[PDB]
Amino acid sequence: GSDKQEAELRRQMEGTGVEVQRQGDDIKLIMPGNITFATDSANIAPSFYAPLNNLANSFKQYNQNTIEIVGYTDSTGSRQHNMDLSQRRAQSVAGYLTAQGVDGTRLSTRGMGPDQPIASNSTADGRAQNRRVEVNLRPVP
């Protein structure tokens, strides 16, 4: 890319529920919790294996960016516990991508718990939107 990978990602993620955002120099992929994970677990949902397979192929093909995997939660419960849970979910996505052949040295992962909500934690579907994993692709020189 950056334009080319973004267009390839938009095509592959069509109909998966994964959102693709152009964010200045960066590409951000929003993976909602309700379609990425089974229940409130950190196991990847059966239906999301093939979308992740496509993502891994894209990352392997476009080698000139870093891959930052960030887990998020809603604000219900303890901050420590949410950071824990969000870290677990980012771990699972990163572990899957590396199993598919993405160089582990290109990946970093964080849990952020309830920080940076994308919607209101006062409504049920707002809280559900905040439970997500984000993949940020940042260009390198």
Side-chain angles (χ1 to χ4, degrees):
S2 196
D3 301 349
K4 196 161 158 295
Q5 184 176 21
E6 187 199 345
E8 270 164 51
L9 284 169
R10 281 187 194 283
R11 192 138 187 118
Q12 290 174 311
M13 292 304 110
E14 182 162 29
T16 66
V18 174
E19 319 163 11
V20 182
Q21 305 193 342
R22 160 68 51 180
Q23 188 61 39
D25 298 330
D26 301 345
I27 303 175
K28 175 192 288 171
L29 309 161
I30 308 288
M31 301 165 25
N34 72 309
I35 68 107
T36 305
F37 299 104
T39 191
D40 70 336
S41 76
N43 307 132
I44 298 162
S47 65
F48 204 69
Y49 276 43
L52 280 173
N53 290 344
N54 278 294
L55 280 180
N57 291 339
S58 177
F59 302 161
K60 274 208 286 327
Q61 192 190 90
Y62 293 103
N63 57 256
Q64 302 229 329
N65 50 45
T66 62
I67 304 158
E68 202 215 3
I69 302 162
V70 183
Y72 296 89
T73 61
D74 60 277
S75 67
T76 282
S78 156
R79 170 174 284 260
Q80 150 180 124
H81 188 56
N82 283 332
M83 300 273 289
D84 193 320
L85 291 174
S86 66
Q87 161 101 330
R88 293 182 207 177
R89 285 181 157 194
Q91 158 266 323
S92 292
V93 173
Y96 189 94
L97 289 170
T98 47
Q100 291 296 287
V102 177
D103 193 332
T105 296
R106 290 182 57 198
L107 272 42
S108 68
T109 85
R110 331 180 34 237
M112 291 252 277
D115 291 332
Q116 304 181 337
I118 56 164
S120 182
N121 283 302
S122 295
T123 65
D125 63 70
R127 286 187 296 272
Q129 288 172 254
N130 291 331
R131 291 190 297 267
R132 76 220 188 255
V133 166
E134 294 183 2
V135 182
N136 306 298
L137 304 174
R138 170 166 245 152
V140 301

Short mmCIF file of all heavy atoms in Angstrom, two decimals, residues 61-106:
data_model
loop_
_atom_site.label_atom_id
_atom_site.label_comp_id
_atom_site.label_asym_id
_atom_site.label_seq_id
_atom_site.Cartn_x
_atom_site.Cartn_y
_atom_site.Cartn_z
N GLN A 61 2.28 -10.30 2.80
CA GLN A 61 2.55 -9.73 1.49
C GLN A 61 3.04 -8.29 1.59
O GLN A 61 3.96 -7.89 0.86
CB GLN A 61 1.28 -9.81 0.64
CG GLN A 61 1.47 -9.54 -0.83
CD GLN A 61 0.15 -9.42 -1.54
OE1 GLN A 61 -0.41 -8.33 -1.65
NE2 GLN A 61 -0.38 -10.54 -2.01
N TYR A 62 2.45 -7.50 2.48
CA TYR A 62 2.83 -6.10 2.67
C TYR A 62 3.74 -6.00 3.88
O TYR A 62 3.30 -5.87 5.02
CB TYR A 62 1.59 -5.23 2.81
CG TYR A 62 0.83 -5.20 1.52
CD1 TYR A 62 -0.32 -5.95 1.35
CD2 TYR A 62 1.31 -4.47 0.44
CE1 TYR A 62 -1.00 -5.93 0.16
CE2 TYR A 62 0.64 -4.46 -0.75
CZ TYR A 62 -0.51 -5.19 -0.89
OH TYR A 62 -1.16 -5.16 -2.10
N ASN A 63 5.04 -6.04 3.61
CA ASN A 63 6.04 -6.21 4.65
C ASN A 63 6.51 -4.91 5.29
O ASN A 63 7.22 -4.96 6.30
CB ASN A 63 7.25 -6.97 4.08
CG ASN A 63 7.86 -6.28 2.87
OD1 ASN A 63 7.66 -6.70 1.73
ND2 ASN A 63 8.62 -5.22 3.12
N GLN A 64 6.10 -3.76 4.76
CA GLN A 64 6.67 -2.48 5.20
C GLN A 64 5.78 -1.75 6.20
O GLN A 64 5.56 -0.55 6.09
CB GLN A 64 6.95 -1.59 3.99
CG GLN A 64 7.88 -2.20 2.98
CD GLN A 64 9.00 -1.26 2.57
OE1 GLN A 64 8.83 -0.05 2.56
NE2 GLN A 64 10.15 -1.82 2.25
N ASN A 65 5.26 -2.47 7.20
CA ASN A 65 4.61 -1.80 8.31
C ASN A 65 4.76 -2.66 9.56
O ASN A 65 5.04 -3.86 9.49
CB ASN A 65 3.13 -1.50 8.03
CG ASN A 65 2.36 -2.71 7.51
OD1 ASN A 65 2.48 -3.81 8.03
ND2 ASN A 65 1.55 -2.48 6.48
N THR A 66 4.60 -2.02 10.72
CA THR A 66 4.49 -2.74 11.98
C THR A 66 3.04 -3.08 12.24
O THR A 66 2.12 -2.40 11.78
CB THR A 66 5.03 -1.92 13.16
OG1 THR A 66 4.25 -0.72 13.30
CG2 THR A 66 6.48 -1.57 12.96
N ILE A 67 2.83 -4.16 12.99
CA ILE A 67 1.51 -4.66 13.31
C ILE A 67 1.34 -4.57 14.82
O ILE A 67 2.08 -5.21 15.57
CB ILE A 67 1.31 -6.09 12.80
CG1 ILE A 67 1.58 -6.13 11.29
CG2 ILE A 67 -0.09 -6.59 13.12
CD1 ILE A 67 1.93 -7.49 10.75
N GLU A 68 0.38 -3.75 15.26
CA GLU A 68 0.10 -3.54 16.67
C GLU A 68 -1.30 -4.06 16.96
O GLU A 68 -2.28 -3.55 16.40
CB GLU A 68 0.20 -2.05 17.02
CG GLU A 68 0.44 -1.79 18.49
CD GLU A 68 -0.26 -0.55 19.00
OE1 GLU A 68 -0.99 0.10 18.22
OE2 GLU A 68 -0.07 -0.21 20.19
N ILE A 69 -1.39 -5.07 17.82
CA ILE A 69 -2.66 -5.69 18.16
C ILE A 69 -3.05 -5.23 19.56
O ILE A 69 -2.29 -5.43 20.52
CB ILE A 69 -2.58 -7.22 18.08
CG1 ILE A 69 -2.16 -7.64 16.67
CG2 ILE A 69 -3.91 -7.85 18.44
CD1 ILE A 69 -1.63 -9.04 16.57
N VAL A 70 -4.22 -4.61 19.67
CA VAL A 70 -4.65 -3.97 20.91
C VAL A 70 -6.03 -4.49 21.27
O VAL A 70 -6.96 -4.40 20.45
CB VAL A 70 -4.66 -2.44 20.78
CG1 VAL A 70 -5.04 -1.81 22.09
CG2 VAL A 70 -3.31 -1.92 20.31
N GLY A 71 -6.17 -5.02 22.48
CA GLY A 71 -7.45 -5.49 22.98
C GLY A 71 -8.13 -4.43 23.82
O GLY A 71 -7.48 -3.65 24.51
N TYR A 72 -9.46 -4.41 23.76
CA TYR A 72 -10.26 -3.45 24.51
C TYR A 72 -11.45 -4.16 25.14
O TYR A 72 -11.90 -5.21 24.67
CB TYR A 72 -10.78 -2.31 23.63
CG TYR A 72 -9.73 -1.41 23.03
CD1 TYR A 72 -9.17 -1.70 21.79
CD2 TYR A 72 -9.33 -0.25 23.67
CE1 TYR A 72 -8.22 -0.88 21.22
CE2 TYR A 72 -8.37 0.58 23.11
CZ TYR A 72 -7.83 0.26 21.89
OH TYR A 72 -6.88 1.09 21.33
N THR A 73 -11.97 -3.56 26.20
CA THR A 73 -13.20 -4.00 26.84
C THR A 73 -14.11 -2.80 27.08
O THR A 73 -13.74 -1.65 26.83
CB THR A 73 -12.94 -4.71 28.17
OG1 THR A 73 -12.29 -3.81 29.08
CG2 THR A 73 -12.07 -5.94 27.97
N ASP A 74 -15.31 -3.10 27.57
CA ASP A 74 -16.19 -2.09 28.12
C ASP A 74 -15.72 -1.76 29.54
O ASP A 74 -14.68 -2.25 30.00
CB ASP A 74 -17.63 -2.59 28.09
CG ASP A 74 -17.82 -3.86 28.90
OD1 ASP A 74 -17.53 -4.95 28.36
OD2 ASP A 74 -18.23 -3.76 30.07
N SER A 75 -16.47 -0.94 30.26
CA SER A 75 -16.04 -0.45 31.56
C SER A 75 -16.66 -1.20 32.74
O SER A 75 -16.42 -0.82 33.89
CB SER A 75 -16.35 1.05 31.69
OG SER A 75 -17.75 1.28 31.72
N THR A 76 -17.45 -2.24 32.48
CA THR A 76 -17.98 -3.05 33.57
C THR A 76 -16.86 -3.83 34.24
O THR A 76 -16.01 -4.42 33.56
CB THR A 76 -19.07 -4.00 33.04
OG1 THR A 76 -20.29 -3.28 32.84
CG2 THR A 76 -19.31 -5.15 34.00
N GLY A 77 -16.84 -3.83 35.56
CA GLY A 77 -15.87 -4.60 36.30
C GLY A 77 -14.60 -3.84 36.60
O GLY A 77 -14.44 -2.65 36.32
N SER A 78 -13.66 -4.58 37.19
CA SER A 78 -12.41 -3.99 37.65
C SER A 78 -11.50 -3.63 36.48
O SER A 78 -11.46 -4.32 35.46
CB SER A 78 -11.68 -4.96 38.59
OG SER A 78 -10.29 -4.69 38.61
N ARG A 79 -10.75 -2.55 36.65
CA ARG A 79 -9.80 -2.15 35.61
C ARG A 79 -8.72 -3.20 35.44
O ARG A 79 -8.38 -3.58 34.31
CB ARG A 79 -9.18 -0.80 35.95
CG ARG A 79 -8.04 -0.47 35.05
CD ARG A 79 -7.56 0.91 35.34
NE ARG A 79 -8.52 1.83 34.75
CZ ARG A 79 -8.38 2.46 33.58
NH1 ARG A 79 -7.27 2.26 32.86
NH2 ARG A 79 -9.34 3.27 33.13
N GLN A 80 -8.14 -3.69 36.55
CA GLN A 80 -7.15 -4.75 36.47
C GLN A 80 -7.69 -5.96 35.72
O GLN A 80 -7.01 -6.52 34.85
CB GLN A 80 -6.70 -5.16 37.88
CG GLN A 80 -6.26 -6.62 37.98
CD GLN A 80 -5.82 -7.00 39.38
OE1 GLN A 80 -6.35 -7.94 39.98
NE2 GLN A 80 -4.84 -6.29 39.91
N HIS A 81 -8.92 -6.37 36.04
CA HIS A 81 -9.49 -7.56 35.41
C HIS A 81 -9.74 -7.33 33.93
O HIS A 81 -9.54 -8.24 33.11
CB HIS A 81 -10.78 -7.96 36.13
CG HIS A 81 -11.34 -9.27 35.68
ND1 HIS A 81 -10.61 -10.44 35.72
CD2 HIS A 81 -12.56 -9.60 35.19
CE1 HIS A 81 -11.35 -11.43 35.27
NE2 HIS A 81 -12.54 -10.95 34.94
N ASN A 82 -10.18 -6.13 33.56
CA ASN A 82 -10.45 -5.83 32.15
C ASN A 82 -9.16 -5.79 31.34
O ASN A 82 -9.12 -6.27 30.20
CB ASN A 82 -11.19 -4.50 32.03
CG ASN A 82 -12.65 -4.62 32.36
OD1 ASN A 82 -13.26 -5.68 32.19
ND2 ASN A 82 -13.24 -3.53 32.84
N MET A 83 -8.10 -5.19 31.89
CA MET A 83 -6.80 -5.22 31.22
C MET A 83 -6.35 -6.65 30.99
O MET A 83 -5.88 -7.00 29.90
CB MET A 83 -5.78 -4.44 32.06
CG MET A 83 -6.14 -2.99 32.28
SD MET A 83 -5.55 -1.91 30.97
CE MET A 83 -3.80 -1.94 31.28
N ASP A 84 -6.48 -7.49 32.02
CA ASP A 84 -6.23 -8.92 31.92
C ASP A 84 -7.00 -9.54 30.75
O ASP A 84 -6.42 -10.16 29.86
CB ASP A 84 -6.61 -9.59 33.24
CG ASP A 84 -6.12 -11.01 33.36
OD1 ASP A 84 -6.17 -11.76 32.37
OD2 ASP A 84 -5.69 -11.38 34.48
N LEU A 85 -8.33 -9.38 30.78
CA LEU A 85 -9.18 -9.98 29.75
C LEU A 85 -8.82 -9.47 28.36
O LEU A 85 -8.78 -10.25 27.40
CB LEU A 85 -10.65 -9.71 30.06
CG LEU A 85 -11.24 -10.41 31.28
CD1 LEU A 85 -12.65 -9.91 31.54
CD2 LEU A 85 -11.23 -11.91 31.08
N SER A 86 -8.58 -8.17 28.24
CA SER A 86 -8.25 -7.60 26.93
C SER A 86 -6.88 -8.07 26.46
O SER A 86 -6.69 -8.32 25.26
CB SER A 86 -8.31 -6.08 26.99
OG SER A 86 -7.30 -5.56 27.84
N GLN A 87 -5.92 -8.19 27.37
CA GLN A 87 -4.62 -8.76 27.02
C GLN A 87 -4.76 -10.19 26.50
O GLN A 87 -4.11 -10.57 25.53
CB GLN A 87 -3.69 -8.72 28.24
CG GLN A 87 -2.50 -9.66 28.15
CD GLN A 87 -1.20 -8.96 27.76
OE1 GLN A 87 -1.22 -7.97 27.04
NE2 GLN A 87 -0.08 -9.48 28.23
N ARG A 88 -5.62 -10.99 27.14
CA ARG A 88 -5.84 -12.37 26.70
C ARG A 88 -6.35 -12.42 25.27
O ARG A 88 -5.95 -13.29 24.49
CB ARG A 88 -6.84 -13.07 27.62
CG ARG A 88 -6.40 -13.32 29.04
CD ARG A 88 -7.51 -14.06 29.79
NE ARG A 88 -7.49 -13.80 31.22
CZ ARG A 88 -8.39 -14.29 32.08
NH1 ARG A 88 -9.37 -15.06 31.64
NH2 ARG A 88 -8.30 -14.00 33.37
N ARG A 89 -7.25 -11.51 24.91
CA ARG A 89 -7.85 -11.56 23.58
C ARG A 89 -6.86 -11.11 22.51
O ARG A 89 -6.83 -11.69 21.41
CB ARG A 89 -9.13 -10.71 23.57
CG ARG A 89 -10.29 -11.41 24.27
CD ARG A 89 -11.60 -10.63 24.27
NE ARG A 89 -12.74 -11.53 24.44
CZ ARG A 89 -14.01 -11.20 24.23
NH1 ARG A 89 -14.33 -9.97 23.85
NH2 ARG A 89 -14.96 -12.10 24.41
N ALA A 90 -6.04 -10.11 22.81
CA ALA A 90 -5.00 -9.70 21.87
C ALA A 90 -3.95 -10.80 21.70
O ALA A 90 -3.43 -10.99 20.60
CB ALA A 90 -4.34 -8.40 22.34
N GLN A 91 -3.64 -11.52 22.78
CA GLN A 91 -2.72 -12.65 22.71
C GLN A 91 -3.21 -13.70 21.72
O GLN A 91 -2.44 -14.22 20.91
CB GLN A 91 -2.54 -13.27 24.10
CG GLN A 91 -2.07 -14.73 24.10
CD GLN A 91 -3.20 -15.74 24.18
OE1 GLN A 91 -4.21 -15.52 24.85
NE2 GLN A 91 -3.04 -16.86 23.48
N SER A 92 -4.50 -14.05 21.80
CA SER A 92 -5.04 -15.11 20.97
C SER A 92 -4.96 -14.76 19.49
O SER A 92 -4.58 -15.60 18.66
CB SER A 92 -6.49 -15.39 21.36
OG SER A 92 -6.57 -15.96 22.65
N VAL A 93 -5.31 -13.52 19.14
CA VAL A 93 -5.24 -13.08 17.75
C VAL A 93 -3.80 -13.12 17.26
O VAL A 93 -3.51 -13.61 16.16
CB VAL A 93 -5.86 -11.68 17.61
CG1 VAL A 93 -5.65 -11.15 16.20
CG2 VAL A 93 -7.34 -11.72 17.96
N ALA A 94 -2.88 -12.60 18.07
CA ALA A 94 -1.47 -12.60 17.69
C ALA A 94 -0.93 -14.02 17.55
O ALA A 94 -0.18 -14.31 16.61
CB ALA A 94 -0.65 -11.82 18.71
N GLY A 95 -1.29 -14.90 18.48
CA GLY A 95 -0.85 -16.28 18.38
C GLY A 95 -1.35 -16.97 17.13
O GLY A 95 -0.62 -17.74 16.50
N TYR A 96 -2.60 -16.69 16.74
CA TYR A 96 -3.13 -17.26 15.51
C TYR A 96 -2.37 -16.75 14.30
O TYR A 96 -1.96 -17.54 13.43
CB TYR A 96 -4.62 -16.94 15.38
CG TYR A 96 -5.30 -17.68 14.25
CD1 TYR A 96 -5.96 -18.88 14.48
CD2 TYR A 96 -5.28 -17.18 12.95
CE1 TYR A 96 -6.58 -19.57 13.45
CE2 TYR A 96 -5.89 -17.86 11.92
CZ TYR A 96 -6.54 -19.05 12.17
OH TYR A 96 -7.16 -19.73 11.14
N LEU A 97 -2.17 -15.43 14.21
CA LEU A 97 -1.48 -14.85 13.07
C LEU A 97 -0.06 -15.41 12.93
O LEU A 97 0.40 -15.66 11.82
CB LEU A 97 -1.45 -13.33 13.19
CG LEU A 97 -2.80 -12.63 12.99
CD1 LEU A 97 -2.70 -11.16 13.37
CD2 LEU A 97 -3.26 -12.78 11.54
N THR A 98 0.63 -15.60 14.05
CA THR A 98 1.98 -16.16 13.99
C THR A 98 1.96 -17.62 13.57
O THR A 98 2.85 -18.08 12.84
CB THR A 98 2.68 -16.00 15.34
OG1 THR A 98 1.80 -16.42 16.40
CG2 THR A 98 3.07 -14.56 15.57
N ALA A 99 0.95 -18.38 14.01
CA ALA A 99 0.80 -19.75 13.55
C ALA A 99 0.59 -19.82 12.05
O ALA A 99 0.98 -20.80 11.41
CB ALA A 99 -0.36 -20.43 14.28
N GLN A 100 -0.01 -18.78 11.46
CA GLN A 100 -0.22 -18.72 10.02
C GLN A 100 1.01 -18.25 9.26
O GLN A 100 0.97 -18.20 8.02
CB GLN A 100 -1.40 -17.81 9.70
CG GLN A 100 -2.74 -18.37 10.15
CD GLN A 100 -3.10 -19.65 9.41
OE1 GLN A 100 -3.44 -19.62 8.23
NE2 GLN A 100 -3.01 -20.78 10.10
N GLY A 101 2.10 -17.91 9.94
CA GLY A 101 3.34 -17.56 9.27
C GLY A 101 3.72 -16.10 9.31
O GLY A 101 4.73 -15.73 8.70
N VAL A 102 2.96 -15.25 10.00
CA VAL A 102 3.37 -13.87 10.17
C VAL A 102 4.56 -13.82 11.12
O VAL A 102 4.54 -14.42 12.20
CB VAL A 102 2.20 -13.01 10.69
CG1 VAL A 102 2.66 -11.59 10.93
CG2 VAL A 102 1.05 -13.03 9.69
N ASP A 103 5.61 -13.10 10.72
CA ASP A 103 6.82 -12.98 11.53
C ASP A 103 6.47 -12.39 12.89
O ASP A 103 5.94 -11.28 12.98
CB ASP A 103 7.85 -12.11 10.81
CG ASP A 103 9.24 -12.19 11.43
OD1 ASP A 103 9.35 -12.44 12.65
OD2 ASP A 103 10.22 -11.99 10.70
N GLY A 104 6.77 -13.14 13.96
CA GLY A 104 6.44 -12.67 15.29
C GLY A 104 7.12 -11.37 15.67
O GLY A 104 6.60 -10.60 16.47
N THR A 105 8.30 -11.11 15.08
CA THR A 105 9.04 -9.88 15.35
C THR A 105 8.35 -8.64 14.78
O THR A 105 8.69 -7.52 15.18
CB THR A 105 10.47 -10.04 14.79
OG1 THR A 105 11.13 -11.09 15.50
CG2 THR A 105 11.30 -8.76 14.95
N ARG A 106 7.37 -8.80 13.89
CA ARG A 106 6.62 -7.66 13.39
C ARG A 106 5.43 -7.30 14.26
O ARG A 106 4.80 -6.26 14.02
CB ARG A 106 6.15 -7.93 11.96
CG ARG A 106 7.26 -7.95 10.93
CD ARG A 106 6.71 -8.17 9.54
NE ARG A 106 5.74 -7.15 9.18
CZ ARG A 106 4.86 -7.29 8.19
NH1 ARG A 106 4.85 -8.40 7.46
NH2 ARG A 106 4.00 -6.31 7.92
#
